[PDB]
Design a protein around this ligand. Sequence first.
Ligand SMILES: [Mg+2]
Lengths: 16, 177, 219, 68, 244
Amino acid sequence: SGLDAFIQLTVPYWLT
Amino acid sequence: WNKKGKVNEATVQARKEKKRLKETNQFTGDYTGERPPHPWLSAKRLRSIMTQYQVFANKNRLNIKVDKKDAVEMKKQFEEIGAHEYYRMRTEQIINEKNNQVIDQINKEIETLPFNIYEEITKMPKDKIYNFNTDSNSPYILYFEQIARMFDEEHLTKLKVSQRLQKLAEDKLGEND
Amino acid sequence: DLDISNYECWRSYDKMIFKTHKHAARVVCKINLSPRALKHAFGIGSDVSRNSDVSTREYDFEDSNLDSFLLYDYKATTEYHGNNDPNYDYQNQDQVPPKKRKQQHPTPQEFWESDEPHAFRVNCSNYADYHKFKKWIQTEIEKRASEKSYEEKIIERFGPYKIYDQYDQKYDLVKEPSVFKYGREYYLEKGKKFSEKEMEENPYLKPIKPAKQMEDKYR
Amino acid sequence: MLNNIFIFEKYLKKNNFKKNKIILKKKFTPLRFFLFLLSLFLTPFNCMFIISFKINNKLEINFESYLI
Amino acid sequence: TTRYAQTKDGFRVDVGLVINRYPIFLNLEKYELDRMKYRTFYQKKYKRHMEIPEDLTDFNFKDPQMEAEETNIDNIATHFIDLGAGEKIEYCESSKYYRKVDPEVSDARSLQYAPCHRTYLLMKDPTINQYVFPTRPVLDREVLNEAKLLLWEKISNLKFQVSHTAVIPNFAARRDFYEHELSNPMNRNLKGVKTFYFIATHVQGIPWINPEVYQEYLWTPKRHFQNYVPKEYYEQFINAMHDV
Ligand SMILES: [Mg+2]
């Protein structure tokens, strides 16, 4: 939930 | 004489498209119209953030204890530091009152104008009222060499410098620096 | 299990909880209190940056365990509900539609001075002992009610609020800058000094002596 | 004392907006939206704990912590 | 076909200005600094807040003031040069950089009269030996913001750089009418004069005003605004002033 759920979604794409 | 209103198909689809998309996500990648960020950022630098932010979310009151001796001092320190600030803060509340009165006096008087200029003042273009651009005069710039030396640590200045490169990477105000 | 003895809280003004929207944080609990106690037992609450049309004033507390907090009032004034109507009765008592009925609400300055209780809503960080955070306040207020008001103490320490508005008085400028007084020099550990290399590697450490208004023979 | 400086820059815009309260009201894309929150953990003037939904929002922040 | 702008009450209107320069010396107290020792110390023990990695501390950084000030001729040009054994002592006034500005001066003619507090400039009238801000009237056709510039190119003549953030006026006053202008046949049907003032901020310049119009221009902060001008003029603006 919360802020912690952007971060498994948004970031791991733009690493590559 | 009025009857019930029937439904638009727009409200129908939004109710349905969500359920298709609660599982999936719209944020994940170029599904959304998304430009890449400032290339100063790298795959490794995000992991520098993630690997340490993963650490911060896993912190609690139960991963940590504190000695009472450290605690009792923390009262008088942050109590009195706050006491200076409540004096400071409560002034702004008093200040902003008198500031807003001045606005109220003039808005009564703006009615007491001729026809020509009274149009513009009410019907100004928002581009002029919407100026949030910086200046050479900004208290982060004007006092930068002073404030860089007043702190107790360089780290607390690095809190500022690393902060800007982010915001410069957001609005794309940084380029090849 | 709650014990105020080892437990310790206070108030802060920059260590805070941040919201992106009003209802992002869950209402962890509710506390019924007269606002009059708070202003007398605690400072006046700062302005609102997170709860826009909901509340009027916030509060920011902290814990021995380094756990932040918030308090606020939820739709208790006319600022949300709107002003009262002197023409509408408030005694029709469900002759017009009940959904159309509207109760009378208080103005803030009437509300804050009231002894009447009101539910104050709490927000927290992850996994704090908010159950302790209640009785701390609820007991602390029982002390500071009789003792003394918080503002009057600060007037005794710092004097009245100085705004520089009065024609009748005659005020005094300030001329000393804090730059030359203060630096990292004061806040280093005692019995130490900067390495003369570090003193020169970091140009920020190099002291300054204030410019002197030199004699005007030489222009 | 920096808090006492922005009172002027905020005052003048009250006249421009004819409002008693001013907020800058940005809206960010996802990547930009997260980094702006990293900024806010790591200010020297405020230590923060952040709470939010799963969806980006029109953020309503004071100018005090704003900087470029 | 000249007609000064008029109200429904009938009063006359005058564009006005107030100009300032931001203060230079910041008085940071200890309690605002005391944190920066404490809150870092307690962090290192327990670390209840986000700390930074090392990969973010690799970039190049510049001081905006260092490089930009070494080119500013106002900063460069030092008035009072002397000689010394090898290296030489010098000094500049009428510049904005904080070292060269002195903490103790008396020159109300100059910008640096009180670097701690902010100050606003004032202007004497040729009619009366009283300090007031610049003013001028407005025609029935002209505009406040247009007239704002007509005053600007008048007194400044582009020797004096200022930013104009405010487009909607910030103050307004109601004076009693002059004695001299009673001769004017225009003002006798108007019966009043108002002054909608704007505010602007000094940059990268040096004050100069045509002595033809106004002379003997001085500065002052919010607090010693008492001395240079009466009380009826005092109470109007001080609710809005800012002693930084
Ligand atoms: Mg019909």
